[PDB]
Amino acid sequence: GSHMEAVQNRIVEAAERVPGVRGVIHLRARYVGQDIWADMIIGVDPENTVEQAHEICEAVQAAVCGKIRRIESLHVSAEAREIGDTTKPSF
Amino acid sequence: SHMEAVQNRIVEAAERVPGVRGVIHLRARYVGQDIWADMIIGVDPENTVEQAHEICEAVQAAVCGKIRRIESLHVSAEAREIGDTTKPSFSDQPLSFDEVMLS
Ligand SMILES: [Cu+2]
Ligand SMILES: [Cu+2]
Ligand SMILES: [Cu+2]
């Protein structure tokens, strides 16, 4: 709880540096023992191809799971998001 | 095991929605009396994210409408060629307490 703000910021920070990510729409996370379980919605170009979005989800999984190692489970789903949209994550 | 009848009922409903080229994966599980499920459907590879999402919404509508003991359904789309068969892969693995609390 106290420490859940920091891991949320580390995950958003890592996710948004991935090419093809237009921001993190939603992220919920929970500790289980020492490891983090989280599910995240990333925003993506609405006109990307389904295959292109699956690559971006896949790359987001590698970069967040790779930089933060207290994560045991991360579920990433992709959603269309317009280029002008600047809504910050909600958590 | 015990999930077989509803798992096939769900695949049946999904595959009748236009634009679904078969159901790739389906996991369904009870949480109390309510069913929680997630599935991956195969869609035309040049579907845009926007076009595929409409198929997902239409798949959520047909399944959540036909079965109604479904409390949660997650649908994701993945590229699948028109000639591809490969019958759906099923899982019936239960939800941890923490997973339910995640949502
Ligand atoms: Cu893949
Ligand atoms: Cu998913
Ligand atoms: Cu939707």
mmCIF file with all atom_site columns, C-alpha atoms and ligand atoms in Angstrom:
data_model
loop_
_atom_site.group_PDB
_atom_site.id
_atom_site.type_symbol
_atom_site.label_atom_id
_atom_site.label_alt_id
_atom_site.label_comp_id
_atom_site.label_asym_id
_atom_site.label_entity_id
_atom_site.label_seq_id
_atom_site.pdbx_PDB_ins_code
_atom_site.Cartn_x
_atom_site.Cartn_y
_atom_site.Cartn_z
_atom_site.occupancy
_atom_site.B_iso_or_equiv
_atom_site.pdbx_formal_charge
_atom_site.auth_seq_id
_atom_site.auth_comp_id
_atom_site.auth_asym_id
_atom_site.auth_atom_id
_atom_site.pdbx_PDB_model_num
ATOM   1   C  CA . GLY A 1 1   ? 0.000   0.000   0.000   1.00 0.00 ? 1   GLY A CA 1
ATOM   2   C  CA . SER A 1 2   ? 2.521   2.557   1.218   1.00 0.00 ? 2   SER A CA 1
ATOM   3   C  CA . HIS A 1 3   ? 5.023   1.032   -1.207  1.00 0.00 ? 3   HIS A CA 1
ATOM   4   C  CA . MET A 1 4   ? 2.465   0.463   -3.978  1.00 0.00 ? 4   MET A CA 1
ATOM   5   C  CA . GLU A 1 5   ? 2.764   4.002   -5.301  1.00 0.00 ? 5   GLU A CA 1
ATOM   6   C  CA . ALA A 1 6   ? 6.479   3.575   -6.068  1.00 0.00 ? 6   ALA A CA 1
ATOM   7   C  CA . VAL A 1 7   ? 6.151   0.278   -7.922  1.00 0.00 ? 7   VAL A CA 1
ATOM   8   C  CA . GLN A 1 8   ? 3.268   1.787   -9.926  1.00 0.00 ? 8   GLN A CA 1
ATOM   9   C  CA . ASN A 1 9   ? 5.491   4.705   -10.954 1.00 0.00 ? 9   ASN A CA 1
ATOM   10  C  CA . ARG A 1 10  ? 8.346   2.361   -11.881 1.00 0.00 ? 10  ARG A CA 1
ATOM   11  C  CA . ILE A 1 11  ? 6.004   0.301   -14.074 1.00 0.00 ? 11  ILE A CA 1
ATOM   12  C  CA . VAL A 1 12  ? 4.453   3.297   -15.853 1.00 0.00 ? 12  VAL A CA 1
ATOM   13  C  CA . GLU A 1 13  ? 7.924   4.788   -16.350 1.00 0.00 ? 13  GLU A CA 1
ATOM   14  C  CA . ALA A 1 14  ? 9.174   1.575   -17.959 1.00 0.00 ? 14  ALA A CA 1
ATOM   15  C  CA . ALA A 1 15  ? 6.029   0.993   -20.013 1.00 0.00 ? 15  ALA A CA 1
ATOM   16  C  CA . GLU A 1 16  ? 5.869   4.466   -21.587 1.00 0.00 ? 16  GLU A CA 1
ATOM   17  C  CA . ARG A 1 17  ? 9.417   4.290   -22.942 1.00 0.00 ? 17  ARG A CA 1
ATOM   18  C  CA . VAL A 1 18  ? 8.442   1.354   -25.200 1.00 0.00 ? 18  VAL A CA 1
ATOM   19  C  CA . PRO A 1 19  ? 8.020   2.343   -28.881 1.00 0.00 ? 19  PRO A CA 1
ATOM   20  C  CA . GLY A 1 20  ? 4.418   2.301   -29.944 1.00 0.00 ? 20  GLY A CA 1
ATOM   21  C  CA . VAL A 1 21  ? 3.062   3.061   -26.482 1.00 0.00 ? 21  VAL A CA 1
ATOM   22  C  CA . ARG A 1 22  ? 0.906   6.158   -26.295 1.00 0.00 ? 22  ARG A CA 1
ATOM   23  C  CA . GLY A 1 23  ? 0.731   6.161   -22.543 1.00 0.00 ? 23  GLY A CA 1
ATOM   24  C  CA . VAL A 1 24  ? -0.565  3.824   -19.889 1.00 0.00 ? 24  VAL A CA 1
ATOM   25  C  CA . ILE A 1 25  ? -4.330  3.990   -19.614 1.00 0.00 ? 25  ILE A CA 1
ATOM   26  C  CA . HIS A 1 26  ? -4.792  1.932   -16.436 1.00 0.00 ? 26  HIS A CA 1
ATOM   27  C  CA . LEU A 1 27  ? -2.619  -0.015  -13.998 1.00 0.00 ? 27  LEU A CA 1
ATOM   28  C  CA . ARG A 1 28  ? -3.743  -2.050  -10.987 1.00 0.00 ? 28  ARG A CA 1
ATOM   29  C  CA . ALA A 1 29  ? -1.229  -3.919  -8.866  1.00 0.00 ? 29  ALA A CA 1
ATOM   30  C  CA . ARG A 1 30  ? -1.109  -5.989  -5.695  1.00 0.00 ? 30  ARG A CA 1
ATOM   31  C  CA . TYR A 1 31  ? 1.572   -7.585  -3.569  1.00 0.00 ? 31  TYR A CA 1
ATOM   32  C  CA . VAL A 1 32  ? 1.585   -11.304 -2.936  1.00 0.00 ? 32  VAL A CA 1
ATOM   33  C  CA . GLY A 1 33  ? 4.428   -12.157 -0.649  1.00 0.00 ? 33  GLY A CA 1
ATOM   34  C  CA . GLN A 1 34  ? 7.265   -10.155 -2.152  1.00 0.00 ? 34  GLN A CA 1
ATOM   35  C  CA . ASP A 1 35  ? 6.192   -10.302 -5.793  1.00 0.00 ? 35  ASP A CA 1
ATOM   36  C  CA . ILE A 1 36  ? 3.939   -7.981  -7.720  1.00 0.00 ? 36  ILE A CA 1
ATOM   37  C  CA . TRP A 1 37  ? 0.866   -9.018  -9.646  1.00 0.00 ? 37  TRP A CA 1
ATOM   38  C  CA . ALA A 1 38  ? -0.390  -6.291  -11.939 1.00 0.00 ? 38  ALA A CA 1
ATOM   39  C  CA . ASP A 1 39  ? -2.626  -5.780  -14.931 1.00 0.00 ? 39  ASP A CA 1
ATOM   40  C  CA . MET A 1 40  ? -2.183  -2.791  -17.220 1.00 0.00 ? 40  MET A CA 1
ATOM   41  C  CA . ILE A 1 41  ? -3.949  -1.211  -20.177 1.00 0.00 ? 41  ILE A CA 1
ATOM   42  C  CA . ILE A 1 42  ? -1.643  0.567   -22.612 1.00 0.00 ? 42  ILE A CA 1
ATOM   43  C  CA . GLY A 1 43  ? -2.809  3.005   -25.253 1.00 0.00 ? 43  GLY A CA 1
ATOM   44  C  CA . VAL A 1 44  ? -1.861  2.318   -28.885 1.00 0.00 ? 44  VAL A CA 1
ATOM   45  C  CA . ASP A 1 45  ? -2.344  3.898   -32.302 1.00 0.00 ? 45  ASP A CA 1
ATOM   46  C  CA . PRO A 1 46  ? -5.915  2.916   -33.337 1.00 0.00 ? 46  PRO A CA 1
ATOM   47  C  CA . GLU A 1 47  ? -4.724  2.183   -36.885 1.00 0.00 ? 47  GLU A CA 1
ATOM   48  C  CA . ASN A 1 48  ? -1.955  -0.194  -35.923 1.00 0.00 ? 48  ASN A CA 1
ATOM   49  C  CA . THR A 1 49  ? -2.485  -3.753  -37.166 1.00 0.00 ? 49  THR A CA 1
ATOM   50  C  CA . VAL A 1 50  ? -3.518  -6.450  -34.667 1.00 0.00 ? 50  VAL A CA 1
ATOM   51  C  CA . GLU A 1 51  ? -0.072  -8.003  -35.201 1.00 0.00 ? 51  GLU A CA 1
ATOM   52  C  CA . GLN A 1 52  ? 1.629   -4.655  -34.587 1.00 0.00 ? 52  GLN A CA 1
ATOM   53  C  CA . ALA A 1 53  ? -0.213  -4.212  -31.315 1.00 0.00 ? 53  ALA A CA 1
ATOM   54  C  CA . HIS A 1 54  ? 0.682   -7.737  -30.172 1.00 0.00 ? 54  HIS A CA 1
ATOM   55  C  CA . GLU A 1 55  ? 4.347   -6.870  -30.740 1.00 0.00 ? 55  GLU A CA 1
ATOM   56  C  CA . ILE A 1 56  ? 3.924   -3.734  -28.600 1.00 0.00 ? 56  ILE A CA 1
ATOM   57  C  CA . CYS A 1 57  ? 2.196   -5.665  -25.810 1.00 0.00 ? 57  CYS A CA 1
ATOM   58  C  CA . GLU A 1 58  ? 4.934   -8.287  -26.038 1.00 0.00 ? 58  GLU A CA 1
ATOM   59  C  CA . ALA A 1 59  ? 7.662   -5.627  -25.875 1.00 0.00 ? 59  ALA A CA 1
ATOM   60  C  CA . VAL A 1 60  ? 5.959   -3.921  -22.928 1.00 0.00 ? 60  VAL A CA 1
ATOM   61  C  CA . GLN A 1 61  ? 5.933   -7.227  -21.082 1.00 0.00 ? 61  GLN A CA 1
ATOM   62  C  CA . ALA A 1 62  ? 9.662   -7.742  -21.659 1.00 0.00 ? 62  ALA A CA 1
ATOM   63  C  CA . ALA A 1 63  ? 10.706  -4.215  -20.639 1.00 0.00 ? 63  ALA A CA 1
ATOM   64  C  CA . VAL A 1 64  ? 8.612   -3.987  -17.460 1.00 0.00 ? 64  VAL A CA 1
ATOM   65  C  CA . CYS A 1 65  ? 9.307   -7.563  -16.383 1.00 0.00 ? 65  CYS A CA 1
ATOM   66  C  CA . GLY A 1 66  ? 12.942  -7.029  -17.306 1.00 0.00 ? 66  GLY A CA 1
ATOM   67  C  CA . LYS A 1 67  ? 13.627  -3.788  -15.448 1.00 0.00 ? 67  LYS A CA 1
ATOM   68  C  CA . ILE A 1 68  ? 11.527  -4.511  -12.325 1.00 0.00 ? 68  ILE A CA 1
ATOM   69  C  CA . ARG A 1 69  ? 12.180  -7.957  -10.900 1.00 0.00 ? 69  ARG A CA 1
ATOM   70  C  CA . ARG A 1 70  ? 9.751   -7.965  -7.993  1.00 0.00 ? 70  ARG A CA 1
ATOM   71  C  CA . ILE A 1 71  ? 7.039   -8.643  -10.603 1.00 0.00 ? 71  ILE A CA 1
ATOM   72  C  CA . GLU A 1 72  ? 5.749   -12.211 -10.787 1.00 0.00 ? 72  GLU A CA 1
ATOM   73  C  CA . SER A 1 73  ? 2.765   -11.631 -13.034 1.00 0.00 ? 73  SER A CA 1
ATOM   74  C  CA . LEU A 1 74  ? 2.010   -8.804  -15.429 1.00 0.00 ? 74  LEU A CA 1
ATOM   75  C  CA . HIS A 1 75  ? -0.988  -8.826  -17.735 1.00 0.00 ? 75  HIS A CA 1
ATOM   76  C  CA . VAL A 1 76  ? -0.893  -6.253  -20.569 1.00 0.00 ? 76  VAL A CA 1
ATOM   77  C  CA . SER A 1 77  ? -3.882  -5.388  -22.774 1.00 0.00 ? 77  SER A CA 1
ATOM   78  C  CA . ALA A 1 78  ? -3.790  -2.813  -25.612 1.00 0.00 ? 78  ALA A CA 1
ATOM   79  C  CA . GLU A 1 79  ? -6.435  -0.201  -26.389 1.00 0.00 ? 79  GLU A CA 1
ATOM   80  C  CA . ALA A 1 80  ? -6.828  2.419   -29.101 1.00 0.00 ? 80  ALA A CA 1
ATOM   81  C  CA . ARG A 1 81  ? -5.741  5.892   -28.067 1.00 0.00 ? 81  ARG A CA 1
ATOM   82  C  CA . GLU A 1 82  ? -5.608  9.005   -30.205 1.00 0.00 ? 82  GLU A CA 1
ATOM   83  C  CA . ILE A 1 83  ? -2.380  10.908  -30.852 1.00 0.00 ? 83  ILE A CA 1
ATOM   84  C  CA . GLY A 1 84  ? -3.643  14.047  -29.095 1.00 0.00 ? 84  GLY A CA 1
ATOM   85  C  CA . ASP A 1 85  ? -4.816  12.270  -25.953 1.00 0.00 ? 85  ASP A CA 1
ATOM   86  C  CA . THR A 1 86  ? -2.708  13.214  -22.887 1.00 0.00 ? 86  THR A CA 1
ATOM   87  C  CA . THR A 1 87  ? -4.725  11.571  -20.057 1.00 0.00 ? 87  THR A CA 1
ATOM   88  C  CA . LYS A 1 88  ? -2.416  10.452  -17.263 1.00 0.00 ? 88  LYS A CA 1
ATOM   89  C  CA . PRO A 1 89  ? -2.762  6.920   -15.836 1.00 0.00 ? 89  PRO A CA 1
ATOM   90  C  CA . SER A 1 90  ? -5.550  6.503   -13.263 1.00 0.00 ? 90  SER A CA 1
ATOM   91  C  CA . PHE A 1 91  ? -4.345  3.567   -11.049 1.00 0.00 ? 91  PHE A CA 1
ATOM   92  C  CA . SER B 2 1   ? -12.896 -31.925 -16.134 1.00 0.00 ? 1   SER B CA 1
ATOM   93  C  CA . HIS B 2 2   ? -16.044 -30.101 -15.063 1.00 0.00 ? 2   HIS B CA 1
ATOM   94  C  CA . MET B 2 3   ? -15.931 -26.998 -17.336 1.00 0.00 ? 3   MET B CA 1
ATOM   95  C  CA . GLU B 2 4   ? -16.450 -28.790 -20.642 1.00 0.00 ? 4   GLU B CA 1
ATOM   96  C  CA . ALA B 2 5   ? -20.117 -28.027 -21.339 1.00 0.00 ? 5   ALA B CA 1
ATOM   97  C  CA . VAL B 2 6   ? -19.885 -24.265 -20.782 1.00 0.00 ? 6   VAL B CA 1
ATOM   98  C  CA . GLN B 2 7   ? -16.473 -24.026 -22.505 1.00 0.00 ? 7   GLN B CA 1
ATOM   99  C  CA . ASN B 2 8   ? -17.936 -25.477 -25.701 1.00 0.00 ? 8   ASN B CA 1
ATOM   100 C  CA . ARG B 2 9   ? -21.065 -23.327 -25.339 1.00 0.00 ? 9   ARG B CA 1
ATOM   101 C  CA . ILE B 2 10  ? -18.813 -20.233 -25.257 1.00 0.00 ? 10  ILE B CA 1
ATOM   102 C  CA . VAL B 2 11  ? -16.702 -21.268 -28.261 1.00 0.00 ? 11  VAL B CA 1
ATOM   103 C  CA . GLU B 2 12  ? -19.897 -22.035 -30.159 1.00 0.00 ? 12  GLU B CA 1
ATOM   104 C  CA . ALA B 2 13  ? -21.268 -18.528 -29.537 1.00 0.00 ? 13  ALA B CA 1
ATOM   105 C  CA . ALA B 2 14  ? -17.983 -16.785 -30.299 1.00 0.00 ? 14  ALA B CA 1
ATOM   106 C  CA . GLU B 2 15  ? -17.420 -18.576 -33.619 1.00 0.00 ? 15  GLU B CA 1
ATOM   107 C  CA . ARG B 2 16  ? -20.798 -17.510 -34.975 1.00 0.00 ? 16  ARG B CA 1
ATOM   108 C  CA . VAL B 2 17  ? -19.802 -13.798 -34.704 1.00 0.00 ? 17  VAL B CA 1
ATOM   109 C  CA . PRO B 2 18  ? -18.730 -12.322 -38.076 1.00 0.00 ? 18  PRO B CA 1
ATOM   110 C  CA . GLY B 2 19  ? -15.008 -11.681 -38.248 1.00 0.00 ? 19  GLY B CA 1
ATOM   111 C  CA . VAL B 2 20  ? -13.956 -14.392 -35.800 1.00 0.00 ? 20  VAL B CA 1
ATOM   112 C  CA . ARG B 2 21  ? -11.706 -16.917 -37.544 1.00 0.00 ? 21  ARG B CA 1
ATOM   113 C  CA . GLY B 2 22  ? -11.974 -19.443 -34.755 1.00 0.00 ? 22  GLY B CA 1
ATOM   114 C  CA . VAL B 2 23  ? -11.246 -19.282 -31.042 1.00 0.00 ? 23  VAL B CA 1
ATOM   115 C  CA . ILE B 2 24  ? -7.552  -19.756 -30.247 1.00 0.00 ? 24  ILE B CA 1
ATOM   116 C  CA . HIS B 2 25  ? -7.670  -20.019 -26.426 1.00 0.00 ? 25  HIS B CA 1
ATOM   117 C  CA . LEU B 2 26  ? -10.335 -20.134 -23.740 1.00 0.00 ? 26  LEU B CA 1
ATOM   118 C  CA . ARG B 2 27  ? -10.005 -20.272 -19.990 1.00 0.00 ? 27  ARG B CA 1
ATOM   119 C  CA . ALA B 2 28  ? -13.136 -20.432 -17.842 1.00 0.00 ? 28  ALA B CA 1
ATOM   120 C  CA . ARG B 2 29  ? -13.546 -20.878 -14.096 1.00 0.00 ? 29  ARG B CA 1
ATOM   121 C  CA . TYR B 2 30  ? -16.100 -20.476 -11.388 1.00 0.00 ? 30  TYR B CA 1
ATOM   122 C  CA . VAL B 2 31  ? -15.730 -17.905 -8.617  1.00 0.00 ? 31  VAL B CA 1
ATOM   123 C  CA . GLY B 2 32  ? -18.554 -18.842 -6.320  1.00 0.00 ? 32  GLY B CA 1
ATOM   124 C  CA . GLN B 2 33  ? -21.510 -19.340 -8.673  1.00 0.00 ? 33  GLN B CA 1
ATOM   125 C  CA . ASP B 2 34  ? -20.205 -16.873 -11.255 1.00 0.00 ? 34  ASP B CA 1
ATOM   126 C  CA . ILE B 2 35  ? -18.079 -17.717 -14.291 1.00 0.00 ? 35  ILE B CA 1
ATOM   127 C  CA . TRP B 2 36  ? -14.888 -15.800 -15.117 1.00 0.00 ? 36  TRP B CA 1
ATOM   128 C  CA . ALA B 2 37  ? -13.428 -16.378 -18.555 1.00 0.00 ? 37  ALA B CA 1
ATOM   129 C  CA . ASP B 2 38  ? -10.792 -15.031 -20.897 1.00 0.00 ? 38  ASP B CA 1
ATOM   130 C  CA . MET B 2 39  ? -10.412 -15.905 -24.559 1.00 0.00 ? 39  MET B CA 1
ATOM   131 C  CA . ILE B 2 40  ? -8.247  -15.158 -27.559 1.00 0.00 ? 40  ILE B CA 1
ATOM   132 C  CA . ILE B 2 41  ? -10.018 -15.041 -30.907 1.00 0.00 ? 41  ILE B CA 1
ATOM   133 C  CA . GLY B 2 42  ? -8.382  -15.167 -34.312 1.00 0.00 ? 42  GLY B CA 1
ATOM   134 C  CA . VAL B 2 43  ? -9.086  -12.239 -36.635 1.00 0.00 ? 43  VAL B CA 1
ATOM   135 C  CA . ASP B 2 44  ? -7.919  -11.068 -40.051 1.00 0.00 ? 44  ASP B CA 1
ATOM   136 C  CA . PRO B 2 45  ? -4.261  -9.961  -39.664 1.00 0.00 ? 45  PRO B CA 1
ATOM   137 C  CA . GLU B 2 46  ? -4.883  -6.588  -41.358 1.00 0.00 ? 46  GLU B CA 1
ATOM   138 C  CA . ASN B 2 47  ? -7.610  -5.669  -38.930 1.00 0.00 ? 47  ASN B CA 1
ATOM   139 C  CA . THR B 2 48  ? -6.647  -2.412  -37.272 1.00 0.00 ? 48  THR B CA 1
ATOM   140 C  CA . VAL B 2 49  ? -6.732  -2.252  -33.472 1.00 0.00 ? 49  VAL B CA 1
ATOM   141 C  CA . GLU B 2 50  ? -10.036 -0.360  -33.821 1.00 0.00 ? 50  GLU B CA 1
ATOM   142 C  CA . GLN B 2 51  ? -11.542 -2.927  -36.221 1.00 0.00 ? 51  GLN B CA 1
ATOM   143 C  CA . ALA B 2 52  ? -10.525 -5.877  -34.047 1.00 0.00 ? 52  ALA B CA 1
ATOM   144 C  CA . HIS B 2 53  ? -11.846 -4.250  -30.906 1.00 0.00 ? 53  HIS B CA 1
ATOM   145 C  CA . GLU B 2 54  ? -15.296 -4.100  -32.468 1.00 0.00 ? 54  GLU B CA 1
ATOM   146 C  CA . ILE B 2 55  ? -15.176 -7.862  -33.055 1.00 0.00 ? 55  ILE B CA 1
ATOM   147 C  CA . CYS B 2 56  ? -14.220 -8.325  -29.387 1.00 0.00 ? 56  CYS B CA 1
ATOM   148 C  CA . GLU B 2 57  ? -17.090 -6.154  -28.258 1.00 0.00 ? 57  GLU B CA 1
ATOM   149 C  CA . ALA B 2 58  ? -19.398 -8.175  -30.494 1.00 0.00 ? 58  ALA B CA 1
ATOM   150 C  CA . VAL B 2 59  ? -17.936 -11.415 -29.027 1.00 0.00 ? 59  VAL B CA 1
ATOM   151 C  CA . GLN B 2 60  ? -18.435 -10.171 -25.449 1.00 0.00 ? 60  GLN B CA 1
ATOM   152 C  CA . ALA B 2 61  ? -22.041 -9.302  -26.354 1.00 0.00 ? 61  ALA B CA 1
ATOM   153 C  CA . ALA B 2 62  ? -22.886 -12.685 -27.823 1.00 0.00 ? 62  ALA B CA 1
ATOM   154 C  CA . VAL B 2 63  ? -21.302 -14.703 -25.029 1.00 0.00 ? 63  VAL B CA 1
ATOM   155 C  CA . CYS B 2 64  ? -22.285 -12.574 -22.046 1.00 0.00 ? 64  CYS B CA 1
ATOM   156 C  CA . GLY B 2 65  ? -25.800 -12.411 -23.541 1.00 0.00 ? 65  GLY B CA 1
ATOM   157 C  CA . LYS B 2 66  ? -26.204 -16.150 -24.144 1.00 0.00 ? 66  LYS B CA 1
ATOM   158 C  CA . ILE B 2 67  ? -24.700 -17.493 -20.901 1.00 0.00 ? 67  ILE B CA 1
ATOM   159 C  CA . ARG B 2 68  ? -25.389 -14.781 -18.304 1.00 0.00 ? 68  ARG B CA 1
ATOM   160 C  CA . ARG B 2 69  ? -23.787 -16.686 -15.428 1.00 0.00 ? 69  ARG B CA 1
ATOM   161 C  CA . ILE B 2 70  ? -20.639 -15.008 -16.729 1.00 0.00 ? 70  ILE B CA 1
ATOM   162 C  CA . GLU B 2 71  ? -19.517 -12.201 -14.419 1.00 0.00 ? 71  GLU B CA 1
ATOM   163 C  CA . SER B 2 72  ? -16.238 -11.429 -16.159 1.00 0.00 ? 72  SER B CA 1
ATOM   164 C  CA . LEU B 2 73  ? -15.078 -12.045 -19.712 1.00 0.00 ? 73  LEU B CA 1
ATOM   165 C  CA . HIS B 2 74  ? -11.812 -10.788 -21.258 1.00 0.00 ? 74  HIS B CA 1
ATOM   166 C  CA . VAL B 2 75  ? -11.504 -11.025 -25.059 1.00 0.00 ? 75  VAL B CA 1
ATOM   167 C  CA . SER B 2 76  ? -8.264  -10.388 -26.950 1.00 0.00 ? 76  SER B CA 1
ATOM   168 C  CA . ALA B 2 77  ? -7.659  -10.682 -30.697 1.00 0.00 ? 77  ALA B CA 1
ATOM   169 C  CA . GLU B 2 78  ? -4.641  -12.208 -32.411 1.00 0.00 ? 78  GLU B CA 1
ATOM   170 C  CA . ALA B 2 79  ? -3.771  -12.559 -36.068 1.00 0.00 ? 79  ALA B CA 1
ATOM   171 C  CA . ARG B 2 80  ? -4.874  -15.876 -37.569 1.00 0.00 ? 80  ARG B CA 1
ATOM   172 C  CA . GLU B 2 81  ? -4.847  -16.928 -41.216 1.00 0.00 ? 81  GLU B CA 1
ATOM   173 C  CA . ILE B 2 82  ? -8.070  -17.932 -42.954 1.00 0.00 ? 82  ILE B CA 1
ATOM   174 C  CA . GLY B 2 83  ? -6.851  -21.495 -43.579 1.00 0.00 ? 83  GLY B CA 1
ATOM   175 C  CA . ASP B 2 84  ? -5.789  -22.018 -39.962 1.00 0.00 ? 84  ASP B CA 1
ATOM   176 C  CA . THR B 2 85  ? -7.714  -24.645 -37.998 1.00 0.00 ? 85  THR B CA 1
ATOM   177 C  CA . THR B 2 86  ? -6.057  -25.751 -34.721 1.00 0.00 ? 86  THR B CA 1
ATOM   178 C  CA . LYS B 2 87  ? -9.004  -26.331 -32.411 1.00 0.00 ? 87  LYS B CA 1
ATOM   179 C  CA . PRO B 2 88  ? -9.200  -24.048 -29.362 1.00 0.00 ? 88  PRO B CA 1
ATOM   180 C  CA . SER B 2 89  ? -6.897  -24.721 -26.473 1.00 0.00 ? 89  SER B CA 1
ATOM   181 C  CA . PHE B 2 90  ? -8.853  -24.903 -23.229 1.00 0.00 ? 90  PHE B CA 1
ATOM   182 C  CA . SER B 2 91  ? -7.797  -24.217 -19.661 1.00 0.00 ? 91  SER B CA 1
ATOM   183 C  CA . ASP B 2 92  ? -9.911  -24.518 -16.499 1.00 0.00 ? 92  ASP B CA 1
ATOM   184 C  CA . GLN B 2 93  ? -7.287  -23.361 -13.994 1.00 0.00 ? 93  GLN B CA 1
ATOM   185 C  CA . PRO B 2 94  ? -8.750  -21.670 -10.904 1.00 0.00 ? 94  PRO B CA 1
ATOM   186 C  CA . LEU B 2 95  ? -8.286  -18.047 -9.909  1.00 0.00 ? 95  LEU B CA 1
ATOM   187 C  CA . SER B 2 96  ? -6.090  -17.304 -6.916  1.00 0.00 ? 96  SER B CA 1
ATOM   188 C  CA . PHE B 2 97  ? -7.583  -15.196 -4.160  1.00 0.00 ? 97  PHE B CA 1
ATOM   189 C  CA . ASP B 2 98  ? -5.167  -12.444 -5.113  1.00 0.00 ? 98  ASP B CA 1
ATOM   190 C  CA . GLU B 2 99  ? -6.139  -12.538 -8.796  1.00 0.00 ? 99  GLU B CA 1
ATOM   191 C  CA . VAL B 2 100 ? -9.792  -11.952 -7.913  1.00 0.00 ? 100 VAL B CA 1
ATOM   192 C  CA . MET B 2 101 ? -8.752  -9.047  -5.719  1.00 0.00 ? 101 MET B CA 1
ATOM   193 C  CA . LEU B 2 102 ? -6.720  -7.627  -8.607  1.00 0.00 ? 102 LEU B CA 1
ATOM   194 C  CA . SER B 2 103 ? -10.063 -6.981  -10.356 1.00 0.00 ? 103 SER B CA 1
HETATM 195 CU CU . CU  C 3 .   ? 2.772   -14.435 -30.181 1.00 0.00 ? 1   CU  C CU 1
HETATM 196 CU CU . CU  C 3 .   ? -5.098  -10.670 -21.911 1.00 0.00 ? 2   CU  C CU 1
HETATM 197 CU CU . CU  C 3 .   ? -13.635 -2.618  -25.453 1.00 0.00 ? 3   CU  C CU 1
#
